[PDB]
């Protein structure tokens, strides 16, 4: 089952910022994966909406400093 969720990240000026998110994300219970993509400025989070939630991990990202918001939820990304 699981779900894919796609989010736009603002402030992660270094790859270490991004990696720190991945670290936090991994620390959330019932996450599958969540590699942060340093080009499109987006992360594709994969998890189950049972033990974790988009809103929860949002706060977990905000906890690190940089901002996060919705982007999509079907391996799509979108942009110009
Ligand atoms: Cu950084």
From Swiss-Prot:
Residues 3-69 form the HMA domain. Cu(+) 2 binds at residues 14, 17. Induction: By Cu(2+). It comes from the Bacteria. Monomer at sub-stoichiometric copper concentrations. Homodimer at higher copper concentrations. Forms a heterodimer (electrostatic interactions) with CopZ during the transfer of Cu(+). The copZA operon is activated by CueR and indirectly repressed by YfmP. Belongs to the cation transport ATPase (P-type) (TC 3.A.3) family. Type IB subfamily. Involved in copper export. This is Copper-exporting P-type ATPase. It comes from Bacillus subtilis (strain 168). The chain holds residues 72 to 146 of 802 of the full protein.
